[PDB]
Structure formats: C-alpha cells, structure tokens
C-alpha cells in the first residue's frame, strides 16, 4: 500500500588533523537503491538496485554533486559542533542526518521529515507541519535561529512535498516489478524441550518483503504478553527479511498456544499451531 | 552592511602573465562561484565552492585556478594568459548550495598580445544645430569618443561641475572603427539634450567625460606616445548665443 | 550543460506584457532563478522559485513546470526601467548553478509627439569637424549602417528629459571627412516623409 523514500547520511570525525568518514544511503521502502561512501574509489553516487541504473549521466553527476555538498556541509558542522559543545579535537564525533517523505496508497504526499543528530542524540528536527523546528537543547537553538533566518524550512518543504514525492513516484513506476511486489512470509514452528516439564515453541517468519510484520502469541485466544521473546526483524541478505517469536510453555500444553502472523503479502492472517 | 566585493574592477594584461582577481564576502555564505560573461554566450560557470575548504570545476575551468582557505575569500587566478579569456568576470555567493546567488561588481578583463595597440580616447564635443534650436526649442550636444582600444570606457556628462542622469543617453555598446582584420579600435557616442534657454545662456559649462581604463603602471612601455594609462580625457563647450 | 532561453532582442512597447521563457536539460533541477542585468552592471535577483506553479511578486509572475522543464517570467505593466537583459539560472545539483544565454528586452517609449528630422552639428574641436544627428522619430523606426566603411551609424538611443516629461530617440553618424553629406547618411534604413534637412 503506502510508500516511503528515505536518505540517511553519516559523517564521522576522526581525531586530530583527521579527514572524516562519509557514508550516504538511499532507500525506497525497505530496498536500498544508492550509495556514496567516502572510502570507495569512485567518489560518485553508485547504483544499488537495478531499476536506478537506467538513469542518465545528468542524474549521476547531479546526485554526486549534492551528496558531496552534503558531506562538505557535514565537515563544517563537525568543526562547529566542537565549538558549540566545548569539545577537544582528540575525540571522534558523529553527525547523522535523515530525510524523506511518506506517501499513501494513491502515491500522494502523506508526511515528510528532516531530522539531525550529534553523537547519537536528537539535535534538531523539522516538525510535522514542515514550517518549524524542535531544538532538543541549547546549541540547537542557535542552529534553529540560523535556519529560521535562512528560510531552511521553506526549502525543505518544497523538496519534501514536491521533489521527494515526484521522484518517489518515478522510482515506483520504473521498478514496479521489484518495488510494488510483496513476498509473503514462509512460516514454520520448531519445538525444543529444555527441561522435563517445560518447552520453547518458536514461530518463524521467513523471506518476507516488506520488513513490516506482526508476530504475536496467543494462549487460548488471548494475547501472550508474558513469556514472549521477540527478536528484531533481520535481513536475509537477498532483499527479504526474517523474524521469530518464542514462548516458554509447560509440556503437554503446547496446543494452547497459537502463533499469529500478519503481513501485507498475506491473503489472510496466518495461524500456526504445533498441532 | 554585508556584501560581496570584487577587485580590481578592470585590468589589462599582457599575454602569459599571471593575475589574481579578488573576491571577498562578509555575509557568512557557504557557497561561492566565478563566472565569465561573453557576447553571445551568457554567463558561464568557471569554478565553484560549496563551503570553506572545498572546490569544484564548473563549465569552463581551464586556464583558471581557484582557492578557498576560509569562508570570506574565493580568489580566482589565471596562470597562462591567452586572449580567449578576454571577458567580464563575476564573482557570486549564496548562503548554501542551490540558494539565490548574490553577485559582485564585475571585473572587465582584456588580455592583449601587443601593448603597442592600447590607445586612449580622443574626445570631442559637438555643439548643437541652429536648425534644431528653431524647430523643437531643445538643444542636443553630442560627444564622440574615438580611437581607443579596448572597450573599457565609462561616459558621463557634467553641467557646471554637476553630473546628470536626465536628458541623456549613451550607446549601449562601443562601435568598431574598422570591423575587419586584427583587434580594431573602438568608438563611442553619447547625447545630452536640454532646452534652448539652458543652452544659449553663456554661464553654462558643458563637459563630456570619458574614463578609460588603461595599463597598470608596472607594465613594459616602450613606444611613441605617452603611457596609455587609466585616464580621464574630457572635452568642453560653453553657452553660445549665436 | 544546457540552459536555453528565448531568442532576443525582444521589443515590447510601454504598458504591455513582456514574456520570457527558459528551458533546461536536467530533470532533477531543484532551484530556479530570474536575474536582471542593466548594461555594464551586475545581475540582481528578481525571483527565486522552488515549487511547481505560480509565484506572484508585484508586476512579476514566475511560473515553474518541472515536467516539461520550463521556467517563465511574465512582466506586466512594463516601465522603461525594465529594459535589461534577463537571465535564467538553474541549479544542476551542488554548486553547478548554470545560466542561460540571456534574453535582451527593450521597452520602447509610447511616443506622444513624433517629429522626425536630421540636423548637422559643428564642433568645439575646430569649425570643420562634422557630425550628423537624427532625432525625435517614433519608436517603430530602426537603424542600419551598412553602406560602406565610410559611414558609421550608431544605435537607436532613448533619452529622458524628466523635468520636461519628453523623450528623444536619436542616432549619430559621421565619416572622417570627404564629400560625405548629412542628407546622404540615413538612407540604408528608410527615412519618413517629412524628415527635415533644413537648408
């Protein structure tokens, strides 16, 4: 149904006289499509999904210029944030930037965002209205006044409501086979006895796309909040995803428990039982 | 008041010489640019810089070096001076990449292969017709600037020591004296028009002023005439009652 | 790369609508700018545009259509101080801000008294140094110099007498000195009926 385009940017200062590591990635939904890495040979934005390869040289020169321009902006910021926070030059520090747009089923603008972090904590984020800012602390208020004076919000609003959305649509058309496709979870259950009276039942969901899934356990038709271990959704490496949920179960009572799988790739919700 | 300043406003180079155009900006802009402007071809990007410390090649980088040590400064340097770099050069800046660019004053640059053929203008003031006076009851003085190379000229009219921007127009471009073989000399005319009462009053001074931008005082001057420097050559007319 | 503007020169009479177009090659271009340049001066910003559609600013309307790669400038109610070369600039990514060739726009005077004549002007630099003035023609007359290398004719030039509310259109001509007349100068492009050569 609904879609997203998301760009993530990391710059890491290296200590002393020391040039920063820069990595930028772009996604559509849960599929990576582009990369810049400052450690690679090319110093160009590079294709990572087959449907972007068809783009002409004006795109590749164009995107590269922008992604470098990001990096060299991040470089100045690393110097500036050292000053704003009274930090020496002997340390390694990190700036992260995220932006992008969400769209609905009709591919119309839903919601845009532009967030910024220093050393893994919120610095400044564009608000939902895209007119204004949350400055998380006092150095970020200085930045908030700069960005307000410079009409940064306006510029980002034009990108997030316009450009982001228009490019998102073109990406979903050109890669319609890959991007508008769902991979239903292939599901199973394993059973390992741990003591003479108890057992772990583990419900597997494998090779699904997109990553969004719900795995829940119920015992006798009621949600098992208690003994649920639920791992973080993990990539398989082939563009699809994996997840499991487990419960601790007294032996003889394994058929009290149902595993429930919700995924948009599925015609109905799935129910699994050990039998 | 924060701005962009370019320096110098005009230079005449001998071929092969090195020259560095200054561009400095107070505005705390991250991005800085250099362009060349030519007759049919608009503005062409030579080099850019998105932040202090980094540069980028534009459309026409060749022959031109660029440098960005700090936020304020973006000087453009020309190593080997070819005649194809004869142009007007514009420095600009913008707060970040892709925002509005704010332009500096402009640099008129002409690289000449031979400093022998750089010439100051000869200036004359033509006093109005009797026929114009008894037709319209207005009087047009004209002024020729003749025999000059290159077209680094600025024309102004002065009445009793005071400049005027009313009743006056000047040719948009200088006109070539012989549009043919080699680098020809230029001509420039302008008209000032006022009433017959203002003209026939003999206590009125009229002055056509041409500021020609010439050689630097450090240059190899060898030949017949005086050193064709940066000079004001004026010409005068008073009020005639006949 | 390619930023392409409307081919000039554009002659538009005073009080009318003037219209400028700009096309660009890069589909991903995100920033668009219209600049004004008076003769021998710096470009100064008219308007920036970022989003598709219409931007109003006084007598100036900007239009952006990203799908057909088009930027436009509509100049309503055009004053004589709009007479400038107009510059379209388009951003091709990071620092690649690229300009069009420029469309030259000249707003002609609405002429309240057309009074075509040709006068001869004597010099202050001697008595025999000679020049020809041709003045007060209506705005639709143009100029041409193309006879020989003898006669240089300048461009058509618009001057404003502000204290008397009057506008004079003029062009100047001379040879060095020969048997070059003042009557036999402005014939390469055609004179009106009663153009006064009074003698």
């Amino acid at each position: 149904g609904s879609h997203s385009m998301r760009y993530f940017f990391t710059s890491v200062s290296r200590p002393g006289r020391g040039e920063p590591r820069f990595i930028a990635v772009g996604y559509v939904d849960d599929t990576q499509f582009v990369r810049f890495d400052s450690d690679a040979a090319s110093q160009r934005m590079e294709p990572r999904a087959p449907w972007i390869e068809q783009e002409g040289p004006e795109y590749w020169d164009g995107e590269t210029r922008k992604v470098k321009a990001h990096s060299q902006t991040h470089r100045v910021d690393l110097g500036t944030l050292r000053g704003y926070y009274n930090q020496s030059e002997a340390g390694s520090h990190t700036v992260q930037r995220m932006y992008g747009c969400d769209v609905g089923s009709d591919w119309r603008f839903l919601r845009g965002y532009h967030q910024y972090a220093y050393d893994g904590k919120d610095y400044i984020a564009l608000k939902e209205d895209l007119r204004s800012w949350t400055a998380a602390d006092m150095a970020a208020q200085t930045t908030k006044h700069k960005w307000e004076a410079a009409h940064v919000a306006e510029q980002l609003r034009a990108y997030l409501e316009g450009t982001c959305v228009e490019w998102l649509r073109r990406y979903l058309e050109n890669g319609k086979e890959t991007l508008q496709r769902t991979d239903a979870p292939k599901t199973h259950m394993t059973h390992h006895a741990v003591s003479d009276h108890e057992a772990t039942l583990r419900c597997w969901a494998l090779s699904f796309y997109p990553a969004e899934i719900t795995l829940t356990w119920q015992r006798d038709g009621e949600d098992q909040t208690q003994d649920t271990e639920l791992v973080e959704t993990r990539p398989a490496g082939d563009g699809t995803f994996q997840k499991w949920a487990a419960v601790v179960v007294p032996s003889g009572q394994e058929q009290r428990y149902t595993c429930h799988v919700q995924h948009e790739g599925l015609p109905k919700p799935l129910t699994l039982r050990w039998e | 008041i924060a701005g962009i300043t370019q320096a110098p406003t005009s230079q005449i180079l001998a071929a092969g010489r090195r020259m560095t155009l200054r561009c400095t900006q107070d505005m705390r802009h991250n991005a800085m640019y250099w362009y060349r402007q030519d007759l049919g071809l608009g503005l062409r990007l030579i080099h850019y810089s998105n932040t202090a410390g980094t540069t980028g090649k534009g459309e026409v980088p060749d022959g031109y070096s660029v440098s960005r040590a700090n936020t304020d400064d973006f000087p453009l340097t020309l190593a080997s001076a070819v005649p194809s770099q004869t142009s007007v050069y514009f420095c600009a800046s913008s707060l970040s990449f892709g925002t509005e660019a704010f332009f500096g004053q402009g640099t008129r640059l002409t690289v000449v292969e031979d400093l022998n053929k750089v010439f100051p203008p000869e200036v004359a003031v033509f006093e109005p017709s009797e026929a114009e006076i008894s037709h319209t009851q207005k009087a047009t003085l004209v002024c020729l600037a003749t025999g000059f190379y290159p077209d680094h000229v600025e024309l102004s009219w002065w009445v009793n020591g005071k400049e005027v921007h009313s009743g006056v127009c000047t040719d948009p471009q200088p006109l070539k004296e012989q549009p043919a073989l080699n680098d020809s000399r230029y001509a420039l005319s302008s008209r000032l028009r006022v009433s017959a009462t203002f003209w026939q009053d003999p206590r009125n001074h009229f002055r056509c002023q041409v500021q020609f931008y010439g050689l630097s005082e450090n240059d190899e001057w060898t030949q017949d005439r005086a050193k064709p420097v940066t000079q004001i050559v004026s010409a005068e007319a008073w009020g005639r009652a006949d | 790369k390619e930023v392409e503007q409307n081919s000039g020169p554009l002659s538009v009479p005073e009080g009318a609508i003037a219209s400028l177009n700009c096309t660009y090659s890069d589909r991903g271009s995100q920033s668009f700018f219209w600049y004004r340049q008076y003769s021998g001066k710096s470009p100064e910003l008219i308007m920036f545009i970022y989003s598709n559609g219409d931007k109003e600013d006084g007598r100036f309307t900007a239009q952006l259509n990203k799908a057909s790669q088009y930027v436009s400038l509509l100049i309503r109610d055009s004053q004589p101080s709009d007479s400038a070369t107009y510059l379209c600039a388009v951003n091709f990514g990071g620092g690649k801000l690229i300009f069009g060739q420029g469309t030259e726009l000249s707003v002609k005077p609405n002429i309240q008294n057309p009074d075509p004549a040709v006068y001869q002007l004597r010099d202050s630099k001697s008595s025999d140094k000679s020049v020809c003035l041709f003045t007060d023609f209506d705005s639709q007359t143009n100029v041409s110099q193309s006879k020989d290398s003898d006669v240089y004719i300048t461009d058509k030039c618009v001057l404003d007498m502000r204290s008397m509310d009057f506008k004079s259109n003029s062009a100047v001509a001379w040879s060095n000195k020969s048997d070059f007349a003042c009557a036999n100068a402005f014939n390469n492009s055609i004179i009106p009926e009663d153009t006064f050569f009074p003698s």
Binding site: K146 | G98 | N91
Partner: peptide, 9 residues
C-alpha cells in the same frame, strides 16, 4: 533524488 535545502549548523 537527494535534496537542496541543507545548510551548515
């Protein structure tokens, strides 16, 4: 496509 409204902090 990536942005252009991004400015030094």
């Amino acid at each position: 496509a990536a942005g252009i409204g991004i400015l030094t902090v």
